[PDB]
Enzyme design. Structure first.
Site, PDB file in Angstrom:
ATOM      1  NE  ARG A 150      -2.148  -1.668   3.486  1.00 49.63           N
ATOM      2  CZ  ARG A 150      -2.424  -1.672   4.697  1.00 49.63           C
ATOM      3  NH1 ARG A 150      -3.805  -1.486   5.113  1.00 49.63           N
ATOM      4  NH2 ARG A 150      -1.649  -2.288   5.454  1.00 49.63           N
ATOM      5  CG  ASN A 180      -4.398  -4.574   2.991  1.00 49.81           C
ATOM      6  OD1 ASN A 180      -4.011  -4.603   1.847  1.00 49.81           O
ATOM      7  ND2 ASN A 180      -3.616  -4.742   3.990  1.00 49.81           N
TER       8      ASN A 180
END
Length: 87
Positions: free
Chosen positions: A17, A35
């Site tokens: 990320r 996520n």
């Protein structure tokens, strides 16, 4: 335009990320990387097509411990996202 990507593979627990966030901001893109419970990652980005394609190139690689299987994408319209947020 807007890029909506579904990232599959070994992509959680590998700094993916923050990797996406850095590449997005370097290209002036806005969006997010979130996520998902199955291990996949949802990435949305808004900006010029050329920038989005370079960004997408990065998403398909990920950081060095990641193993990206596939990135399923659709192209749509910008909603006015600003900044790039991880979740």
């Amino acid at each position: 335009p807007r890029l909506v990507a579904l990232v599959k593979g070994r992509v959680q627990g590998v700094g993916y990320r923050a990797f996406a966030q850095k590449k997005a901001l370097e290209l002036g893109l806005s969006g997010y990387a979130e996520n998902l419970p199955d291990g996949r990652v949802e990435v949305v980005a808004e900006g010029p097509k050329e920038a989005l394609e370079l960004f997408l190139h990065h998403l398909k690689q990920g950081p060095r411990l990641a193993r990206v299987e596939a990135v399923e994408v659709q192209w749509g319209e910008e909603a006015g996202l600003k900044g790039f947020h991880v979740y």
